[PDB]
């Protein structure tokens, strides 16, 4: 119940409109919390909710304390954070709920309260730079001897999600520019409405301006300096939404002296927060306390909006410090790094000059960290260009104990735009330029191929089918990239279709041995847990439906017991082929497989340098071999207006079209093909509840992949799974935090011994090293 | 010298030895063997003050073994805290001084102070040392001791606990004076017996040390329990009462 | 079927005599190939062979090429080699078949062909120095983590067999005189007639001279320069055996100046081949192309002869470059070595000055290898002597990243020379001379024992009894060698005899804990494979039979089920003993047991400084217990002319003398003895096709040791198994290939998971360093 007093939109609204002149808020805060609980956790019964709230009220009462943000922080601090060997750590039994709590509330206010109200032993120096971890000897030594490995680690943004809020305070005006740009589309309009339906761009600037000005006020309190005596002129928090105050009709700003030069840094915040709570150890004024409550509500609300929004001015905020800070953050505390092989996903750009700036800035950041850590003679003291960075980077020897980097651009997809005879045409011409821009950069300086080791495509699956990238990835292959990871988008309209998309990537795309497939939730989720909280009937596009049935018949024709579904799949598929292709003559199910087997051919080669070499590469195979009707259908399948009209139409598909065993049969059938190619699979963080079908982490599909007998199914051919922290869904995240999360749930929920619990997860961690993209 | 003296001596008596001289060597071995029999049996002032700093160096060399690389990587050598604050400070310096010179011969790198002669300069030389896995990592752990229960004073251990309360302050104030020693003073132990005092006696002593930055606590469960069922309860007392976190150790859990 | 089309003696003979004027050789190349297909592989049906030839021709017509190496190399290169991240890598499915091909055809033309037609991506530079390996991320990770461990690497010769061709070209007469001197032996006469009956010393010189002249004339074509017009007389290729053409009384020397300074390196030849094939992408002239076809034929013929022959000035042509190249090749194409603990065996030489230079040269080359890789201040810059090299190498610590070395001399033996109290007498004095030479050099420099660690005896088995090395090894033990390995020869007339030979080595030789054994094929092979294609009766010396029969009785008296064979052994032994010993008064089986137990005693000492110390030791132990019946018999068993004639007689023993389980019981008895003594088994290379009993590598006996179900019979005792790339049987050899060759079979031929297969071979690789002779 503590989270609902720190991250709640409705409670924020009521406090913001209440002036400070009256502090009769005991009933107002209570009623909003119940509503706030109602809009976050619907299923929680009311009788339990009222019972839990009453305990918290008396828990504050028996503490000779008043209800406030300081009061909430205290009960949270003594509940979750306990001092241990490495300073302040987290209780192992209570770590599962802590990760859920970080999905709603930031950790910096919480750590400040614990340090002030329960300091670390011997007053030893402690500065917050990493998220809190629970200490376990079994796993800690594994970190010491074998560093962690990270695969899906994006570079845009910052080290974590919280300090981006600090970067938001750096340029509040720039925040509107990016907020307005997204808000123009209706997709972001509903996304913001989901968190705050009463949200407008002007209101957003108010809260950002309100939060900054509250921070200035409370920083004055922490400084020990007397307030500027405009407190009598201040009664409404809304007065802080314009960065100006009046005193007898006089213009007075909010500027104040900071002994810490970088007032917009995480170090400044923790230093400010600790001093604030120390001065409020026994009693705090009601007026000042509510300002702290508002600031906490603003910070937790914006970050709640930010994590959803992530899945111009902000891009060019610093562009070099974040890259350096990321590697220092990824290194971890201590002399020796906790991460050995860390590969990054950087956003490609359509400007060749901007590309040179992007690669230089990140490579300069990588060299800066290595120079700071490893004192070793450098050819150039200041490289100032990519050529000289490679001169510095070619000197260093890989000894493992420092972070090894392998940049991998991630191609981005867009909505299927009509026209040009096939729905993904502006996409392909844009993607073709992006690849070509990287091509000339690589061929100009071949030494760059030691760091640009792979290519990724992580936007969606509905927006763009996998087979569109077959001409793209293969033409990258002739440039010496030699690694292609495909991040399948898990927004499948049907689970069978989701498995169908996985098979397309394997068969069509050039997933050579050693490559990876990220976010393979479809081939991981349990069919029994997918059906929950779903309507009796689903809906998906006819083209998806037709490709689904053909794919079903490809894997269900082999099974003797699961045969009646394949025969019915063939019967229904040809009937849809009659409706979709609008063909008059006879059509056979065998021809459908043959036609769709050709889908890996290029976009323009269906009508038939590196690209022109690839052009006739798939054109010759079409002409030489005998069949022509599959080409005629494939040509019709691509560039026929009626076919395009029919494909976009939606159809009604029963939820239980394939029974539980049959879906498992498909899920295991693709697994065998998955393991044959020896393709590793990136795993999203467990706390990332994007799918939202998992009510608790204990039923996450990663447990079934690892082979836990409580969750594994018969016929499950083992896979190889690698970890990754890409879209955590929580404000304070790190790989080591996720590593502990895997260990805690296995130790507590499953009862596995600590020695064995590490062993099962160590296999997952080491697989990132087995299938690394870094050169030997 | 003893080995060199004996090897040359045994060569001279390869075929025969004079009867009187041979018996003297026989007598010498019995005296040495009997003394060593008593010495190791004592456990179950001037002895350690011959040089008090060179013997600690010799311990690491013996622990290191032959070859360039030591066969033991981690080594936490327990030592007895001293009731004199100055004497303990000199005792702690000698162990660290002996440790650094062992690194000096083994390592090949610069030193901040060529002649440390004090704990402050030793720590400066020691912080520059990075353990690469071949040398011996050292972590001093003072181990306490007990005696028979002191009759009276409202409970059996009030005069005994007073010395332990003093000894912790002897360790603590020096630790507070030089907080840089936290990385080498890591654990606290108490290895005398069980009948001397129950394990819960150290609960206040461990908690104050824990909150003052020791960060580790090992307890030596002595195996002199009057009955086997009694010995199990002594282990239960340590677990239920002592503040043992996840990563603490127990010695001789034979019971 | 391309193997027969690039290595076939009859085709090369027919191409040599037939002039360059004919263009249609299909009527003869087809007849020659089918004939050559017979003798090389006489186990293929004619119709299948006939169909394969037609398909090969039909595939050429598909690519409208002309029948020749440019056509043949294209098909082979595209079928096997695939471009990958590290360059050209063999396909995993085709690796097993590739290794069989490698035993007969060099990969240098194949890799050169692939580089020309489908080169490396992004114009990345590919330097051809190492043989191709298949790429698997699982195995690659482990080998980079824990480097490969090698045990049996012969220092003599160059890195691989391919450049011994290059040396042979560089030494037209030195390799001729080595062949000419070896031609006198009748054994070499049979071997040379085996590969080709028309092989005479003159014929050998003609073909080498032909290859030298063909290489130069094609080099001129490769460089682009026009031909020097002497081709007017170029009709019969046989003219190329005179080093000078005749054209209007003009002497034309075929030698031309190469652009590269050295004309006898792999890079020199590979770059030449790429230039040659590049100009012949479309078509080639028949006269020049046939010259290339001819050139490949002598190369393939001689390389097949060289590797089969293994069943001086040339060795010491450089004596510092060859070993450095050997160390460089063993290091691998990387900064850190692929092979950590490499044991370089070398042949000891009786001449002190000759071998003193050799020992310094290999140490200097090893030191030169470390200096090139690792840089620091050395004790001396130009050692020029054995003492300064050792002082230089004392500074280098074992770091693992480079190659660690430990020389182990392997004694070479001769045929048994009758006389002087024992049949191997002139040998023993030569070996005693060799040991004394080795001992005094250890006195010259005590540090030599740091690198001189083991002693080996690898020539054969039937010639030298294993007990003969008891006095040789023991004196070396007191000399501070501190390790010994015995390499039993696999020429055992009977499988039971092979078991006895390993038993004799364990009993008598001072093989203490940690010592190794080599080529222990006798115990590994199952009886079913051994009897394949053997005659129903086998012949062996009466000396061997008596030793085996008593051995059978010693290890079968315990087993209740196979008890009659133990009794049959005793009765047959005493019956045979009366024939051999020619004794009137009967001899018990127990008396025979003690007679053969005294085989360890020195023959000279039994007939009666360190040599006299051991001489009296055998005499002393004899007189401690007064048996006086066996000792008198043993004296007769060694120094009786009538007995020595009887022991040399051959006796016919049935092939199935003992049942399959009886041999199994005998084997597991030895498997028990190796467990107690903890003796390793450095297995010979898996591609070494010399046992000729396995129809494929799938039936290699090593898998029985590994414990795979379906190959490990019940009752077997686990061993410790090392690896050695000593006698690969293939052209381009490395331990890296062997590790992948084993990995492929378990993953593919045995259906094991990649995680499982790596673990089993990791246990084998680890044993290569658990029992390594390198000092701690």
Please give the C-alpha separations between residue A177 and each of A60, A158, A205, A412, in angstroms, as whole numbers: 42, 19, 10, 22
Return the SS3 of C714. Answer: coil
Relative to beta strand C251-253, strand C244-246 is: antiparallel
Residue C179 to residue C187: CA distance in whole angstroms = 13
Q: Where are the alpha helices (DSSP H) in A404-541?
A: 426-444, 470-477, 495-508, 527-530
- Containing C11, the helix (H) or strand (E) segment is helix C9-17
| Mutant choice from C82, C84, C85 vs A, greatest count of A C-beta within 10 A | C85
Residue C624 to residue C618: CA distance in whole angstroms = 10
Closest residue in A to C135 (Cα) is A513
Q: What is the DSSP letter of A718?
A: -
Sheet with strand A484-487: strands edge to edge: A148-154, A339-346, A404-411, A455-457, A484-487, A516-518
Return the SS3 of A591. Answer: helix
Q: Is the CB of C607 inside 8 Å of chain A's CB atoms? A: no
Q: How far is CA A614 from the centre of its chain?
A: 34
Burial class (CB in 10 A: 0-12, 13-18, 19+), B132: exposed
**What residues of chain C, 107 to 166, have a C-beta less than 8 Å from chain A?**
120-124, 135-138, 140-141, 144
- CA torsion A186→A190→A193→A198, rounded to 10°? 30
**Cβ distance of C124 and A775 shorter than 8 Å:** no
Residue A353 to residue A348: CA distance in whole angstroms = 12
Q: Which two tokens stand for residue A323?
A: 């890259």
**Cβ distance of C144 and A477 shorter than 8 Å:** no
Sheet with strand C456-457: strands edge to edge: C153-154, C344-346, C408-411, C456-457
Measured between its terminal Cα atoms, the distance across chain A in Å is 51
Q: Where are the alpha helices (DSSP H) in A44-107?
A: 46-61, 69-80, 95-102
Among C176, C237, C244, which Cα is nearest to C205's?
C176
Say if residues A13 and A207 touch (Cβ distance below 8 Å): no
| Mutant choice from A122, A133, A139 vs B, greatest count of B C-beta within 10 A | A122
Please give the C-alpha separations between residue A76 and each of A31, A112, A259, A394, in angstroms, as whole numbers: 21, 11, 30, 49
**Cβ distance of B216 and A85 shorter than 8 Å:** yes
Residue C480 to residue C442: CA distance in whole angstroms = 9
The beta-carbon neighbor of A482 closest among C85, C123, C144 is C85
Q: What is the DSSP letter of A7?
A: S
- Containing C344, the helix (H) or strand (E) segment is strand C344-346
Q: Is the CB of B254 inside 8 Å of chain A's CB atoms? A: no
Helix, strand and coil in chain A, % to nearest 5: 55, 10, 40
| Mutant choice from A121, A137, A758 vs B, greatest count of B C-beta within 10 A | A121
**Cβ distance of C121 and A678 shorter than 8 Å:** no
Give chain A positions within 8 Å (CB) of B215: 85, 121
Residue C609 to residue C479: CA distance in whole angstroms = 12
Beta strands in A336-397 (DSSP E): 339-346
Beta strands in C26-100 (DSSP E): 81-84, 87-90
Phi-psi region of B247 (alpha: psi -120 to 50; beta: other; left: phi over 0): left
Say if residues A405 and A396 touch (Cβ distance below 8 Å): no
Give chain B positions within 8 Å (CB) of A136: 246
Cα angle for residues A716, A720, A724 (degrees, 5° grid): 125
Among C153, C76, C74, C336, which Cα is nearest to C733's?
C153
**Cβ distance of C138 and A678 shorter than 8 Å:** yes
Say if residues C315 and C156 touch (Cβ distance below 8 Å): yes
Q: What is the DSSP letter of C458?
A: -
Return the SS3 of C283. Answer: coil
- Give the up-direction half-sphere exposure of residue C609: CA atoms within 13 A in the CB hemisphere: 6
Give chain C positions within 8 Å (CB) of A719: none
| Mutant choice from B128, B207, B210, B215 vs A, greatest count of A C-beta within 10 A | B215
Q: What is the DSSP letter of A532?
A: T
| Mutant choice from A451, A770, A773, A774 vs C, greatest count of C C-beta within 10 A | A770
Gap from A769 CA to chain C (nearest CA, Å): 7
Cα angle for residues B221, B225, B226 (degrees, 5° grid): 170
**Cβ distance of B176 and A122 shorter than 8 Å:** yes
Residue A744 to residue C5: CA distance in whole angstroms = 64
Which string of b and e fits C59-68 if b means at least 16 CB within 10 Å?
ebeeeebebb
Closest residue in A to B173 (Cα) is A122
Gap from B52 CA to chain A (nearest CA, Å): 30
Q: Which two tokens stand for residue A157?
A: 């943004």
Cα angle for residues C409, C411, C412 (degrees, 5° grid): 135
Q: Where are the alpha helices (DSSP H) in chain B?
A: 2-12, 19-42, 54-64, 85-106, 119-127, 159-177, 203-211, 228-241
Among C513, C434, C508, which Cα is nearest to C474's?
C508
**Cβ distance of B247 and A335 shorter than 8 Å:** no
Q: Which two tokens stand for residue A675?
A: 């393991």
Gap from A141 CA to chain B (nearest CA, Å): 11
Q: What is the DSSP letter of A245?
A: E
A175 CB-near residues (< 8 Å, 6+ apart) = A168, A204, A205, A208, A314
Residue tagged 């298949």 (tokens): C134
The values of phi and psi at residue A252, to 5°, are -125, 125
**Cβ distance of A776 and C86 shorter than 8 Å:** yes
DSSP string of C174-221, one letter each residue: HHHHHHHHHHTSHHHHHHHHHH-SS--HHHHHHHHHHHHHHHHHHHHH
Give chain B positions within 8 Å (CB) of A135: 246-247
Residue C723 to residue C767: CA distance in whole angstroms = 8
- Containing C92, the helix (H) or strand (E) segment is helix C92-102
Return the SS3 of C584. Answer: coil
- CA torsion A422→A423→A428→A431, rounded to 10°? 180
Q: Which two tokens stand for residue C665?
A: 């019981």
Return the SS3 of C405. Answer: strand
Give chain A positions within 8 Å (CB) of C92: 513
Say if residues C152 and C688 touch (Cβ distance below 8 Å): no
Residue C273 to residue C282: CA distance in whole angstroms = 16
A644 CB-near residues (< 8 Å, 6+ apart) = A418, A422, A423
Please give the C-alpha separations between residue C555 and each of A732, C522, C667, in angstroms, as whole numbers: 71, 16, 10
Residue C503 to residue C507: CA distance in whole angstroms = 6
Q: How far is CA C345 from the centre of its chain?
A: 12
Say if residues A425 and A419 touch (Cβ distance below 8 Å): yes
**Cβ distance of A512 and C84 shorter than 8 Å:** yes
Return the SS3 of C341. Answer: strand
Say if residues A159 and A322 touch (Cβ distance below 8 Å): yes
Q: Which two tokens stand for residue B68?
A: 């360039």
The beta-carbon neighbor of C121 closest among A477, A513, A775 is A477
Closest residue in C to A718 (Cα) is C753
C132 CB-near residues (< 8 Å, 6+ apart) = C81, C88, C89, C90, C107, C111
Gap from B109 CA to chain A (nearest CA, Å): 14
Q: Is the CB of B176 inside 8 Å of chain A's CB atoms? A: yes
Residue A650 to residue B81: CA distance in whole angstroms = 81
Give chain C positions within 8 Å (CB) of A775: 85
Residue B157 to residue B145: CA distance in whole angstroms = 13
Handedness of CA C373, C374, C380, C384 (dihedral sign): negative
| Mutant choice from B245, B248, B249 vs A, greatest count of A C-beta within 10 A | B245
The beta-carbon neighbor of C121 closest among A478, A771, A776 is A478
**Cβ distance of A84 and B176 shorter than 8 Å:** no
Q: How many CB atoms lie within 10 A of CB A655?
A: 14
Q: Is the CB of A84 inside 8 Å of chain B's CB atoms? A: yes
Q: Which two tokens stand for residue A659?
A: 């029974």
The beta-carbon neighbor of B213 closest among A121, A136, A137 is A121
Give chain B positions within 8 Å (CB) of A92: 246
- CA torsion A661→A666→A672→A674, rounded to 10°? -140
Burial class (CB in 10 A: 0-12, 13-18, 19+), A709: exposed
Return the SS3 of C83. Answer: strand
- Containing C51, the helix (H) or strand (E) segment is helix C46-62
Give chain C positions within 8 Å (CB) of A514: 85, 135, 137
Cα angle for residues C286, C291, C295 (degrees, 5° grid): 150
- Containing C12, the helix (H) or strand (E) segment is helix C9-17
Q: How far is CA A346 from the centre of its chain?
A: 14
Residue tagged 């028949």 (tokens): C286
The values of phi and psi at residue A245, to 5°, are -135, 155
| Chain C: partners with 3+ C-beta pairs within 8 Å | A
Q: What is the DSSP letter of A402?
A: S
Handedness of CA C318, C323, C329, C331 (dihedral sign): negative
Gap from B213 CA to chain A (nearest CA, Å): 5
**What residues of chain A, 359 to 388, have a C-beta less than 8 Å from chain B?**
none
Say if residues C671 and C716 touch (Cβ distance below 8 Å): yes
Gap from A756 CA to chain B (nearest CA, Å): 17
Q: Which two tokens stand for residue C459?
A: 């020539």
For chain C, the C-alpha Rg in angstroms (whole number) is 28
Residue A387 to residue C5: CA distance in whole angstroms = 50
**What residues of chain A, 317 to 336, have a C-beta less than 8 Å from chain B?**
335
Counted residue by residue, chain B has a size of 255
Residue C659 to residue C665: CA distance in whole angstroms = 10
Say if residues C152 and C740 touch (Cβ distance below 8 Å): no
Q: How far is CA B15 from the centre of its chain?
A: 46
**Cβ distance of A449 and C86 shorter than 8 Å:** no
- Give the up-direction half-sphere exposure of residue A679: CA atoms within 13 A in the CB hemisphere: 28
Relative to beta strand C408-411, strand C456-457 is: parallel
Residue tagged 């005590």 (tokens): C446
């Amino acid at each position: 119940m503590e989270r609902f007093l720190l991250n709640s939109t409705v409670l924020l609204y009521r406090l913001s409109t209440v002036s400070l002149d009256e502090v009769s808020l005991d009933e107002r805060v209570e009623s909003s919390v119940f509503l706030a609980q109602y809009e976050q956790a619907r299923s929680l019964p009311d009788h339990v909710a009222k019972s839990a709230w009453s305990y918290l009220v008396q828990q504050i009462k028996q503490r000779n304390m008043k209800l406030g943000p300081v009061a909430i922080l205290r009960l949270i601090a003594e509940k979750f954070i306990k001092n241990e060997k490495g300073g302040p750590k987290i209780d192992l039994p209570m770590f599962s709920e802590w990760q859920t709590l970080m999905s709603r509330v930031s950790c910096l206010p919480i750590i400040a309260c614990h340090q002030v109200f329960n300091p670390g032993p011997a007053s030893q120096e402690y500065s917050f730079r990493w998220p809190l971890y629970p200490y376990h000897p079994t796993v800690e030594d594994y970190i010491t001897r074998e560093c962690l490995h990270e695969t899906h680690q994006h570079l845009n943004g910052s080290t974590s999600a919280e300090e981006c809020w600090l970067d938001a305070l750096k340029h509040p005006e720039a925040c509107l520019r990016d907020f307005e740009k997204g808000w123009a589309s209706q997709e972001m309009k509903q996304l913001c409405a989901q968190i705050d339906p009463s949200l407008t761009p002007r209101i957003f600037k108010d809260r950002l301006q309100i939060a900054c000005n509250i921070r200035e006020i409370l920083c004055r309190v922490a400084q020990g300096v007397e307030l500027p005596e405009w407190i009598a002129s201040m009664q409404n928090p809304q007065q802080l939404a314009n960065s100006t105050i009046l005193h007898n009709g006089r213009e007075y700003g909010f500027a104040t002296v900071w002994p810490i030069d970088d007032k917009y840094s995480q170090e400044s915040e923790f230093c400010w927060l600790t001093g604030l709570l120390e001065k409020w150890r026994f009693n705090a004024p009601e007026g000042l306390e509510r300002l702290l409550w508002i600031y906490l509500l603003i910070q937790n609300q914006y970050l709640t909006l930010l994590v959803q929004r992530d899945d111009m001015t902000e891009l060019r905020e610093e562009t070099e410090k974040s890259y350096l800070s990321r590697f220092k953050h990824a290194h971890g505390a201590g002399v020796y790094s906790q991460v050995r092989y860390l590969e990054g996903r950087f956003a490609p750009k359509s400007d060749p000059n901007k590309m040179q700036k992007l690669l230089f800035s990140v490579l300069r950041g990588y060299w800066e960290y290595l120079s700071a850590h490893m004192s070793m003679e450098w050819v150039h003291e200041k490289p100032l260009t990519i050529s000289q960075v490679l001169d510095n980077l070619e000197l260093v020897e890989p000894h493992g104990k420092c972070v090894e980097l392998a940049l991998v651009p991630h191609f981005i997809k867009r909505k299927p735009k009509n026209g040009e005879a096939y729905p993904h045409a502006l996409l392909f011409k844009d993607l073709k330029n992006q690849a070509a821009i990287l091509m000339d950069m690589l061929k100009s300086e071949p030494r760059l191929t030691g760091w640009i080791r792979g290519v990724d495509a992580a936007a969606n699956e509905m927006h763009a089918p996998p087979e569109l990238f077959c001409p793209l990835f293969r033409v990258l292959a002739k440039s010496g990239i030699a690694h292609f990871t495909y991040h399948v988008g898990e927004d499948f309209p049907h689970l069978i279709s989701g498995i169908r998309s996985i098979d397309d990537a394997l068969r069509f795309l050039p997933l050579r041995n050693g490559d990876r497939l990220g976010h393979c939730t479809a081939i991981g989720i349990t069919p029994s847990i997918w059906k929950r909280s779903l309507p009796l009937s689903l809906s998906m596009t006819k083209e998806t439906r037709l490709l689904d049935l053909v794919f079903i018949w490809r894997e269900l024709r082999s099974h003797p017991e699961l045969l009646r579904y394949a025969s019915d799949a063939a019967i229904e598929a040809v009937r849809l082929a009659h409706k979709v292709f609008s063909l008059e003559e006879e059509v056979s199910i065998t021809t459908l497989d043959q036609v769709f087997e050709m889908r890996g051919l290029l976009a323009e080669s269906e009508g038939l340098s590196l690209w022109l070499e690839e052009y006739e590469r798939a054109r010759e195979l079409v002409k030489t071999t005998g069949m022509k009707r599959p080409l005629k259908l494939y040509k019709q399948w691509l560039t026929s207006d009626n076919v395009r009209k029919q494909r976009a139409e939606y159809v009604e598909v029963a939820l239980e079209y394939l029974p539980d065993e049959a879906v498992v049969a498909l899920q295991q059938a693709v697994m065998a093909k998955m393991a044959d190619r020896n393709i590793a699979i990136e795993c999203p963080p467990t706390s990332n509840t994007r799918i939202s079908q998992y009510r608790n982490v204990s039923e996450h599909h990663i447990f079934r992949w690892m082979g836990l007998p409580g969750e594994a199914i018969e016929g499950d051919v083992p896979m190889s799974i690698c970890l990754g922290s890409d879209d955590p869904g929580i404000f304070a995240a790190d790989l080591k935090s996720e590593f502990y999360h895997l260990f805690v749930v296995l130790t507590r929920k499953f009862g596995l011994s600590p020695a064995d619990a590490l062993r099962k997860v160590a296999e997952v961690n080491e697989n990132g090293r087995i299938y690394r993209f870094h050169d030997v």
